[PDB]
Amino acid sequence: IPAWASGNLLTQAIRQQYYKPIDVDRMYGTIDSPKLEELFNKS
Amino acid sequence: KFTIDDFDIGRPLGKGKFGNVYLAREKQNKFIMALKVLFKSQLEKEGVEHQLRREIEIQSHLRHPNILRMYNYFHDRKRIYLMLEFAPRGELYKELQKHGRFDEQRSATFMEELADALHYCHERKVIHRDIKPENLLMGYKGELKIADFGWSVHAPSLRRRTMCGTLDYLPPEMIEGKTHDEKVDLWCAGVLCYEFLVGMPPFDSPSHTETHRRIVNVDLKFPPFLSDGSKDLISKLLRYHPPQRLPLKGVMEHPWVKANSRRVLPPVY
Ligand SMILES: c1nc2c(NC3CCCCC3)nc(Nc3ccc(N4CCOCC4)cc3)nc2[nH]1
Numbered sequence: 001i002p003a004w005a006s007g008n009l010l011t012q013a014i015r016q017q018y019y020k021p022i023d024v025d026r027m028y029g030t031i032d033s034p035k036l037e038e039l040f041n042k043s
Numbered sequence: 044k045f046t047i048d049d050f051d052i053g054r055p056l057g058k059g060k061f062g063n064v065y066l067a068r069e070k071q072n073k074f075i076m077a078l079k080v081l082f083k084s085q086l087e088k089e090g091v092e093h094q095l096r097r098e099i100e101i102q103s104h105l106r107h108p109n110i111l112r113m114y115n116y117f118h119d120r121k122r123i124y125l126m127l128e129f130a131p132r133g134e135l136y137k138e139l140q141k142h143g144r145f146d147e148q149r150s151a152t153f154m155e156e157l158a159d160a161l162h163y164c165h166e167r168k169v170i171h172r173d174i175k176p177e178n179l180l181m182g183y184k185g186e187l188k189i190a191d192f193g194w195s196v197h198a199p200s201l202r203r204r205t206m207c208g209t210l211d212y213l214p215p216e217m218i219e220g221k222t223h224d225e226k227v228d229l230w231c232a233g234v235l236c237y238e239f240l241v242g243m244p245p246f247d248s249p250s251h252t253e254t255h256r257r258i259v260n261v262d263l264k265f266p267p268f269l270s271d272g273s274k275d276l277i278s279k280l281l282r283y284h285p286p287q288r289l290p291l292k293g294v295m296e297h298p299w300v301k302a303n304s305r306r307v308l309p310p311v312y
Binding site for chain 2: 032033
């Protein structure tokens with residue numbers, strides 16, 4: 001288990017994320033998705 | 044588009060019979076999330092491809108502070124990956140089991156959050172159909188997060204026929220083989236409120252037939268420790284006739300909810 005995912009470092013990161021939310025709508029929501037019909041086809 | 048190499052894998056969060064969920068950090072923005080990993084071959088062999096497709100379609104289009112967000116998804120040669128909001132306080136059912144029952148403050152807060160999330164769903168003609176503690180996770184400040192949409196349906200026009208959900212939570216209309224609508228979620232909210240406060244569902248019985256009997260008779264027997272306010276709300280949700288059930292707006296406005304809820308909305312970007 002990497003350091004970032006365990007003790008205080010995780011707690012602090014989670015707190016930081018709660019109080020400083022990123023624009024997930026543009027950072028992930030604008031990024032292309034595979035078509036749902038493609039999900040079980042070639043990657 | 045995303046690939047698995049865009050994420051630092053931290054640790055497993057949970058195990059399923061189709062894949063696993065991991066705590067992950069996407070490298071670009073150092074943003075901590077959960078990755079649900081499903082195996083394409085297992086999904087096909089079990090014949091659940093269209094089932095998973097529906098769950099993804101529904102959840103990926105919902106944006107609410109009390110609904111677990113699906114940020115995006117991707118696939119590779121063998122696996123489908125769902126990028127999910129991480130719920131730092133974990134399973135609600137584990138918390139209920141640890142405490143036995145929740146106090147009025149905790150329960151009322153959860154009920155406000157639930158009613159708000161379900162209202163959002165119903166506004167979009169999505170019916171959840173499986174509200175129970177096991178389908179709920181908890182945010183950083185303990186906020187309810189609807190996490191699973193396994194029995195959910197987008198039902199724009201037709202009433203529904205599918206018996207689904209969980210024994211102790213089934214509404215009378217499902218047991219009786221009637222058509223159902225979004226008001227099934229109202230019933231389940233009532234069962235949930237009771238279980239929160241009591242630690243057992245209201246129609247608990249040793250047999251499926253006796254549980255069914257108790258549900259259709261609405262054989263509700265309140266423990267003496269419950270407040271009048273909580274019994275009022277539960278009673279108004281657990282109505283035999285779907286049209287008589289307290290609307291979700293009614294739950295949010297209920298005096299017991301107003302007096303006891305300590306709901307906090309998460310900061311937004
Ligand atoms: C998407 N999927 C998530 C989780 N997965 C659960 C586990 C797999 C099936 C049910 C959902 N857990 C989440 N949160 C957890 C936070 C702490 C957890 N722990 C339990 C106690 O020990 C520390 C870690 C477990 C789950 N978040 C999440 N987002």
